[PDB]
Design a protein around this ligand. Sequence first.
Ligand SMILES: Cn1nnc(-c2ccc3c(c2)[nH]c2nc(Cc4ccccc4)nc(N[C@H]4CC[C@H](N)CC4)c23)n1
Ligand SMILES: [Zn+2]
Lengths: 79, 367, 476, 459
Amino acid sequence: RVGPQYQAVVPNLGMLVWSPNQNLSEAKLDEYIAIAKEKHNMEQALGMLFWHKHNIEKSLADLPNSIAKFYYSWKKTRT
Amino acid sequence: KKKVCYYYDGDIGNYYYGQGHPMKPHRIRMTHNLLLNYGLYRKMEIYRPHKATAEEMTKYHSDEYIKFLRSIRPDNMSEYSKQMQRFNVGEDCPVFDGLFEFCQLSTGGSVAGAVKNRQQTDMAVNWAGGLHHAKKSEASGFCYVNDIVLAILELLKYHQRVLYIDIDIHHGDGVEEAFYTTDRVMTVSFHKYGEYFPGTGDLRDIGAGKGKYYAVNFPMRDGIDDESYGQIFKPIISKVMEMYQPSAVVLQCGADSLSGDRLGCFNLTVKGHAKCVEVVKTFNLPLLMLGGGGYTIRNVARCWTYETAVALDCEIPNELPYNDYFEYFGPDFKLHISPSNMTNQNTPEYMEKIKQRLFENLRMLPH
Amino acid sequence: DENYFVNYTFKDRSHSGRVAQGIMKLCLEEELFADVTISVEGREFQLHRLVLSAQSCFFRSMFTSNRVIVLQDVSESVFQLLVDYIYHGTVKLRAEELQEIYEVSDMYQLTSLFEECSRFLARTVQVGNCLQVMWLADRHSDPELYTAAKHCAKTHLAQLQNTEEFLHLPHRLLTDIISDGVPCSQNPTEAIEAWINAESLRTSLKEIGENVHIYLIGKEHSLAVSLHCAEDDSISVSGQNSLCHQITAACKHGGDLYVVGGSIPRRMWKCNNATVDWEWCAPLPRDRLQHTLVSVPGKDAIYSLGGKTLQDTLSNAVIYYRVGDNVWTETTQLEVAVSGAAGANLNGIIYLLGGEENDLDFFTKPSRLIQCFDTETDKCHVKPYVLPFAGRMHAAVHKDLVFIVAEGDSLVCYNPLLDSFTRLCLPESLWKIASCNGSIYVFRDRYKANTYKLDPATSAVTVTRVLLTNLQFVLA
Amino acid sequence: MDENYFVNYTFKDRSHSGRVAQGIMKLCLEEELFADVTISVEGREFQLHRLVLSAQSCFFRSMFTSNNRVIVLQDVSESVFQLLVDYIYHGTVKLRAEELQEIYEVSDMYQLTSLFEECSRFLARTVQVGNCLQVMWLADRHSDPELYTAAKHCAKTHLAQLQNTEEFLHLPHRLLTDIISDGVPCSQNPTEAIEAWINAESLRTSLKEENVHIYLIGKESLAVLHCAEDDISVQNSLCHQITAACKHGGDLYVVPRRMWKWEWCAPLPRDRLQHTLVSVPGKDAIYSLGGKTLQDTLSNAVIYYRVGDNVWTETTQLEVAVSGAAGANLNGIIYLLGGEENDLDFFTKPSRLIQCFDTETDKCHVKPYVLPFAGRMHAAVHKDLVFIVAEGDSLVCYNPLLDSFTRLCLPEASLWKIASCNGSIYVFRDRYKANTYKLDPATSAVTVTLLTNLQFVLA
Ligand SMILES: Cn1nnc(-c2ccc3c(c2)[nH]c2nc(Cc4ccccc4)nc(N[C@H]4CC[C@H](N)CC4)c23)n1
Ligand SMILES: [Zn+2]
């Protein structure tokens, strides 16, 4: 169909959850993530590190500080 | 060397389409989960999409349709009885809780990726979107809001020429119909034709009016292998780029083309599928990657993760990482998949004739 | 044929017919040029050497080897009808004298009447005379009749064990009967033990095992009940599996039930009747509905034919699915597109009947055409003749023929080889039919008597007796 | 019916006719048995069979019943009788122009209607002006309306040279009246031929009396022939594009829905290109078949065109859609040859198929036989058969009654353009650069007899 109304009429406000850190080393970041997981998820640790302006030491110091997953868990268990 | 911006909402896989519906949104989360366990998430910029407003979303769709989508609820369905029979909602597009919220979440990432047109990034990967069937008058297929059209329109604000490459098995008639008349957007779709779901894309149809020799459609038959797919895709995309010179390319990577798909008749591997991304990344142009048709979640997650990895220009081992969804993965537990031996009806003469016809059509494009 | 205007060869297509019409109108209407007198049981007949030699190779040898030829084995009536068949080409076979005409045609090397009589014997084989017809086929070395009789023996040995002829049977025939089939439900061990009153039979006895042969998909939470025709003219129930989906097309291949349906119907499910765990098959690669599914055990395939598209356009597409390879592959397209046409498999040939043919004025008229597709050569063609009724109908292959039941109480018995029908009236709504064991079962569309058991002989229908309000599919 | 296949039914053997025919063919000529009769013809002895001889011929049956020894005929040649016996037994005989009148007379005397009509058609297709009167007398003596009409047509169109031929002078008035009944053209001077006679008033009264029969559309546009004298003579221009054209009794109709004759006619009810057009006079209508739709898709529609009433009427659709085929008209049956057929569901391929359309019963069918060469072809109906030519310089002849083709060589000299005139066949070449040729089908000899382009030729 030609769709004269259907045809398009031709003429960021985004929350940065995580960003890469050039200064931080990949091995250091992996070790920090593993330590956080052992002591206190990977996404949560990455967000905590990002909130600290990419400070591994500060993040480690502050580390101890119908409806919407639940349905998919039952399917995974049944598998 | 390329700034990759990844868009994904945490609570986007909680929009189940009801029992028995092939469209599983949670597959997107699955992909994200793998991106967390493979380790590529650190290298990519992760953003949180914002719910697009109805006024911003209705830039393409009619106001009445947007109001209908907003007002539709599973409980308030008896009153909305004559509205569902004219908007193709209820049978092909099931009504589930938070439909408008899911539409906003899908549209937000696609719009934000296109917005960041600002020359602030190089690649924008949003697996939440990719809906290419929502027509202006009413919804179609499994889509409700055509976020691809909105993203293309947003890109049209700054960029002059926009190329939309679709590799999903379905034709994506919505995108072609949206930009059928206008010559600002050139859409090239490699789809399956012949008593299939779209039934619209064909070699004999091109954009009407000023869109002549723009809407390039490539009919295919079932069981096309990866080697022929690449040997067809590369020359036609090279000719299109040489003759059209798009400012930006909106690459949509549907997951139906993979082998073993529930609603797909093609026979392709992960490399055969995501070699088009490798080919298009060599043109050194701003690029947008979107999701789309995917119904084999195990294969969809692997394909999307491999596509994101090749967008990052990195390499990952075939051994899948021990993710939360590692349970229902295949007994090999490997990333790549071996194509199943299926007869290929795409004879070389047929593909050669179609390629020659499309080259002749592109030769008539003004330059 | 170098030049039509100078010299060329002329071929008359009707010549073969012209000679054919010149014999019956002469050698029978007004007996002339009669050179031979043949007497059978003191009955003289005036026959010509040329026609008999041309038709039969047995009389030609006698002629070339003579006042009157005298025969003893052939009676007067059988000889008269055989002579009428030889001179005219048409004869009315009767079951009362079928054995005599069969053996005479076998002796006289008349292959055309020998093959037809062999198929007649294989069509009307019953448990009462299965052993006798098996022995007759063994004497005359008839493969098809012998294997049909062996099938009947292996499927009814349970009652044949006390038929007074099983005991007085040669060891070779017993070994051949026990070679295959003979499900354990018939208790072959007792029959083998009683046969002696003994090593080859014991070491060669394969038990196939009884399997469900009737499936009823109904109740619209749709239910898929199973039936097992056992005892004598009785039906039992041995399964109430429910897929809890919307099945829109199904086909029975072997002892497994394959169904297609659900929301956005493209998937496929399989039930082996031994468990409630459905197996997943390759999804249908086409978006079609009202497409017929036919199971071909000879190629071990499932053919989906016809069906409408999402654009309200008929599709003449044929796709076969391999049971082993689990792959769908396209094949030769149909001559004319149909939707809802009844599909029946017969010795590897698929017959599509009726449906909804595309009318000239963009409509779907009720079709009556018969189109046959040959699986071996992958070719299809439309039969010149048409069915008496047009519309939706259910077709079931029994023996060597097809029973078709349409709207109303009409029941034809179309035979593909003879290109002829046979009208039959059901007792006084679209009925459905199935072929279980060696009889025909008829189920009404809606019941609130429901099952009628009938056989083609004597056109006798008897009421026979889980309950399903709706019966949308029946598979045999 | 009322016959249960499991109880009682009648079996019909469709191979009985073939069986008996093969038995007669094999057990009589290859090995002679049960002859029981001898036939003497000019000393030659034949061991025939009374049953076979009297089967398809009542002449022998009429005399065999009405009174066994040797029988001698009166006027039958040995070779003629041998070939007659072969035709009676084998069913396939090789007809030759040498013994053509004798076999025709014998088959007329004998009871062989198929051979009689075959010889009648043979005489009709081989009639010449020199021996036209002999064929006319032969047809008049026997019962053969078709040969009589063919001889009348041959004599009427060549009555100019029949004024003094030593046969027209001695021709009886009974045949002369029938010959002059037809519309002999005034260009042949019928008055002088009638006045020649033997050297009355009713014969002079029954003297009802040339028109252009060849039209060439070329130059991309000019539409220009009259075959006169012995073995052509000549400029209307329309300057209009033409996708199809036809000739209906000297009316050059040219076709998109515009119609011209330069007289406007009723518009086409459908827009098609490269559609075959024929002028079947049996139903007095012009038929359009095949073609390509405006949407670059092959068409499958057929529409009538009555000359008396310009009402284009639809009819039954063709089984197979073709475009650019060759259309031939023969006794009310339309033959579509070759063309462009659908391939790969998206393109067109050369096709060599025969589409037979019965206008009287409004039916369509496809013949199993295929043309020797596919592609674009041009066909012309000379005399109860169709000559087809195309690029390659290899002419073919197809007789619809028989299941056979005949190849013929052509000068190498561009797609050819064949015609069909009353005199002989004319073949043209698209590239002028060759020129007009005339070929005799019997001798296969072509002799030579301005538009740069020749896109359409109509005869
Ligand atoms: C991107 N994408 N992925 N999957 C699909 C998709 C979406 C929908 C369908 C589909 C595939 N296959 C289908 N087959 C049938 C069966 C059928 C065939 C021929 C004639 C009649 C029925 N009906 C379908 N829907 C109807 C549409 C009209 C409405 N009134 C009721 C539901 C669909 N799109
Ligand atoms: Zn899709």
